[model samples]
Target: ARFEEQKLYIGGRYVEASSGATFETINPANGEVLAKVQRASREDVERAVQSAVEGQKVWAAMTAMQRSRILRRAVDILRERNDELAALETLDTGKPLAETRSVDIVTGADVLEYYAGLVPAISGEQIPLRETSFVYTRREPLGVVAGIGAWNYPVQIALWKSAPALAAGNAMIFKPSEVTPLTALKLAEIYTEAGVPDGVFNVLTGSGREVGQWLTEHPLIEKISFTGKSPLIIFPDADLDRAADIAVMANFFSSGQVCTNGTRVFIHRSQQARFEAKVLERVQRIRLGDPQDENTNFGPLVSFPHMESVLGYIESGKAQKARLLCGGERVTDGAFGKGAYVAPTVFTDCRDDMTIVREEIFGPVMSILVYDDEDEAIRRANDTEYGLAAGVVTQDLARAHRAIHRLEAGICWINTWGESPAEMPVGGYKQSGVGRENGLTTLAHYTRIKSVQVELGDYASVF
Candidate 1:
């Protein structure tokens, strides 16, 4: 077991929660206690905000190149600490160790470099109106930005929110999910070693209600970014096997604990049979075991409560009389007995109004709804308030184009499913969230637009 750092990161030092409170983080694989993480309060949140305010003043004054320089150093540190970070992530989240290494940690560090690269490229515009006057726009840091990371991807979300903000010169006060905060705290140490200025990056661990919402409503906090369940729609005319594979990966990726995985899949009536069969075949093949094992395909959910929550979604499906194809119970036998494990579950005949279809399960259970055709695909996908990410698998060029246009999601895929490219902005449509992340354009969100108007000393006063 690798225990990196377990403490609140405030003002560049590892300290206990302000209230001296702590909570335990468990290894979801075997339900073993990993560490007792400190918790923060509203007062602690204020302290972080004040500290971040001071840090932001220092950070924002630096040249874009200078800031990116430290971030570049941070990128190097991320790579150096990759193994420990990945193992910590796997231990905290119950995701496969290889996946934690290859996907989560790699992406987090790579994006930091990418964001660093974008920092120097941050530019402003000069606008010339009349010859007598000129106006130029300068993008400035919003200062003291805040975020609450979802549990499924701790390090990834931390970077997703901070990398761009820091690159744009804003100090951050971020809360990694209480269930998985070790890697986040560890990253704070990495960034500090990379010569990142003191108080520039702050990491807090606590429940969402306690610290997350309070930070959001804080007067000093300028902006907040969150990544949550991104739903995907699978149209019938597209590839069944591919859609099935997507559903499995989307629903089961990180044991189906993803914000962007294609959780709500809509299969057209024409391909339900084939889609179901392919999905079942693939779903059954998933190997559930230790997250640290290189060969394991499916790992446990985050914790006992989360496992129960996933199972509760299944029971809702059954209670609602939605057809359960396979796997609706906890896996507590043999090798699976010690962990917070639940078999991958699927429900068919899901109505748009059902709880299973409406709420985010955040686990390995998926809900399938059948639609008529391309005409209804967009509406079906857009029916819910959540419009984070969506997918349409049709190869028909026109229909695919139309689906992309009509599906009310931040990021949509034609035939693929996963996180969007670094250049593209990602976010939710409605209740899913506010504001966009990634993309150089989102970097502007970290800044306030200040218009500088010069009189040009040719003042023809018209009184």
Candidate 2:
């Protein structure tokens, strides 16, 4: 096994944790220690934030063209190191190597390139004012930003959140999930080599309690971008089949460690049977084995605790009277015997009030809740406190449009399951998260708008 001695990136330097504490990242595939990373403390976070604040000033001062050039260079570096990065990501997160190489790496690089193109195109617009004064809006960097990335797609999500922020000239600090921090830390080096200012981007690897929350609630972080389960509340109006597919995918993708993986899904009653069957067919076909195997569709969970969580959800589902249609057992076969592997699980006859249905089980377990109609489906989907990302699948375009209008989620997909583009806006509607993470709107989130009003009249008063 490869071992890495990780350090925190702050003020353009890589150093140990301020508190002198460290944590080991384990490979879920074999419970082997892959690396030891610094466990950041409050002091470390403060320094990172401070460095970002200072770096933002310098980065923001650069013209859009300059920023674009630097980001394009970063993209070039990423392309050059694509194989290495993908391998590290696969090793760190236990995702399929094929996925890491084809999906995650390619998409991550494309996002940087996409934002690089946006750099020179970023401009404010002029608005007509009723008075003789000329009015226009200018987009300015948010100063400092904090990004909380999920483990399943660490490389991709980190790039998605940080790249645009950097392109828009905002300095950033990222808190990659404790389960997968290697790829993130490695990217810090790539950013440095790409000529991004030393303090422009920093990665702090630790638990959510110690690092994520501290960063999210930090006052110096002008914007907080998080991708994970809804904190508590969840809301409704989603397509049943689509929701089930997304929920299943979210829960099963990377063995259900995804933050935005649809854990809780609300389905309309009229379509329950059809939706459940369709979802199960797809879920059942997911191949499980070694992540390096090209045919493997499912890998081990990130850790034993995570595997236990999925198993616990299964038991909870059974206890709550939700019928298990397929995959309610752990797999100890082939390459899966050595790791934290759980079979794909489906639960039906689930009530909205069941623990399995209500809680965020970040594993390959899905809960299917039945609703009476569109209104009930909407109500049930929105019943919980989360409004992150919802999917509506229907042949009827009118229903799809109505669901989109009514769903309170930040990002909603129609007819599709789990497809998100780097150019589209991503975030939550409620406790799902705060602020957005992708595309032009994401650029706006990383910037604070300033409107300048100048009087053109001779009688204009100076304030």
Candidate 3:
């Protein structure tokens, strides 16, 4: 509970921002003060950057085995504190505690352990050139990593950002979303306990408007990993029953705060009735209450501003001629009245121009559009400027394969949605963002490659 009074972690120490100002993080479930987190300023960020530069030099010097052991220890710490971490994450993000336990907390350890195994494998590759000469490529640390976490998965993204960079022998300065900063503070303790030297890993707690820009624009920041809003596409042949369930839970998953949730479900015209039957019923049964409640499946939105924003999107759906099939209202019952709560909303018969369909919204609002054909479906799905994530739910092998290849996003789900494992690539394709964040592909993002050529038996000659 003292996490609110927790201060900024700089150079491996828990300290306040240079300006000494702090902000409050409230529980969306009841609008209670979760904690008063420190608000890091530009100067505070710069200090962290300096510390990172120094830290990277030391971390980069460690042997792969050395780094591997420490990272593995961090993973062990995560598992040991699983319950405590999940509880804090649920408290801060308003996601279900059950999900936080099974998904976020578990994935945090799994990802770090995965990267630890990859540490020794981060070696140079040999290229067969002339027999007289030797040629190969090697990966080098990129120095300081600057990461910004989304509120949806605080603990998961924190590890997702830091683990790979650490595995590749680089220092990191992480800034979790201002609204949710608890689990990240907990991670810092584990980092120190695992014997990570001073400044090797840092967490900055502040608003994205100020500290976010500073972290991104800072010259020392060598890599950035930001996972935010994205859409979910549903094809005509998609298993109507399964697709409907995934669509409902995926959109409203964590109250639809996930960047990878299927925010927009583009279904086939012929399958409207089936999707309605399966999806609407699921939405109706979603139980919302205190996030700490063991049986509660859905909780309040992260804050009042977010709840209001979602409501505004629903109103826009009305103005744009979209039909509100169900749940375009607020819910306040028993202890839920004081909290920021909005029912899961679905907008059907929508056009592309509707704000609810075009904007990120970042809430439990779904804009379902009926498409006539595959060409039109893919075209409409790709029309959005955001390309963070997409899905193709169908039984036809060719159709599913075709959609996965053509989808313009970084992550594509077929038959299933929102269950990406750690050993695969997870990132956006375009304005959604650059660079990969998961799997072997992301190793390149965390480390830079250099080609090396050498003379064998002194036979090499230069012009």
Candidate 4:
């Protein structure tokens, strides 16, 4: 398989970063430079946004059936290039090839197909305003949307944001994470080949400070969709176990490189021991090895800095007197030597005030802090500034319901962790993010509502 030298794609064309500068996309498995990708600048983001804004008008005018046809074609294209795309994702992100190929690629294709089916299902509603007057509401595309893709599952997250946005007639500008942008660029190409019109979808590869910030704050971008760890904040009344799981997965999945990976686990003092034991058991079982190996449950951190960041958090946990239950060292026992590998770490005897518990480590380390009771649990969980997601595990239905009602996060899970469906909306409550993704609500988010009204009163009333 041939890899493109210049990896930035915008305006339906593959080009180099505007700065004429490039960075190596490293293979986390062996710490080798996988490919050189264009490091886009602010100019590139602005250009991409402009292209999307121009293309949105043309795309919106097309009938739903036409949009569906194009999206279905994209799904077909993905199926044909599934192997190539999956291989690229694993090579770039250091995720297991089986997961990249089977889960990420397959789900990405399903998302495209799902939205293709949803094209016709999306419609307007009619309300009877009065005996003689009727009010009808219709959904309209939101024009240009900015989609920020996370590194852990680059292709999947990009598809999660882009597919529905395109299906609903919105043009999209994608800013893939700097650590892993190769697969995203490839998907952008596949979209163009699948008959997606120029400007309808654009991919910009660069740093978050340069590309991500531009996409988020751009005025032309009506909707900004992001998937990553909530920016180091916490919410109250969140189920400690559930929140811990999400934090662990969001922070550490893909070796704590996931946006929504669980960064911290806050447990009530009463249930601290039980919670830590259960969560630690799950983390311990994550097998790290060659990403291509089917038996490997987890792989190396996406980059060396990421691994170091996680290791730093582990040290912080120890400094704060958090008991390290297991895995505080790097794994170099495999075919790869000195690769970006950190053992799945769990800390018991944790305090809420500790930095390790309070911050987003974004690694495989799990920090478990205890609270006195329900009130304290809620207080501790909600204490952090971020409120993207939280979960609760309890047999008490009333307690769970109460927690759900009081929890400050946007999405709440009960009894289980990290379970989300494309049909359900996902987003943060506060600084975790803005807007929502997935489901009918998200479809509307990608679109604008326009009301078409006609005067039913006769001219005699004016006379």
- Please, what are the lDDT tens digits per residue for candidate 3 over residues 1-463? 4443878887789887776787888888788888888888888888888888898888888888999999999888888889989898887888878778777878767778878887887767998777878788988998888887777778878887888878888898988888888888889889989988789899898864788788789888987766533556677667788888888877887787766777778888888887887888888898877888889888888888899888888888988889888888878877888888888888888888888888888888888888898888888888888887788877897878877788798777777777654543331111122233345566667888899987775653696
TM-scores, one per candidate: 0.89, 0.83, 0.89, 0.83
In every candidate, how many clashes are there?
Answer: 3, 12, 4, 28
Please give the distance, in angstroms, between residue 137's alpha carbon in candidate 2 and its true position after superposition. 5.6
Residue-level lDDT of model 1, residues 296-396, one tens digit each, is 97899988898888888888889998999889899889878899889988888888888888888888888888888666767777777777778777667
lDDT of 4 at 451: 85
Overall local distance difference test of candidate 1: 0.79
Better of 1 and 4 by TM-score: 1
Worst 10 residues of 4 by lDDT: 425-434
Q: What would the TM-score be for candidate 2 when compared with the true structure?
A: 0.83
Worst 10 residues of 3 by lDDT: 427-436
Candidate 1 colliding pairs, count: 3
Q: Model 3: residues >4 Å from true position, as ranges?
A: 1-4, 125-138, 228-238, 421-440, 450-463
**Local lDDT at 251 for model 4:** 44
Model 4 misplaced regions, further than 4 Å: 1-4, 41-43, 46-50, 125-138, 213-220, 228-252, 261-285, 334-336, 421-438, 456-463
Q: Candidate 3 — which pairs collide?
A: 4-35, 4-36, 238-393, 238-394
Q: Give the Cα lDDT of each candidate.
A: 0.79, 0.75, 0.80, 0.73
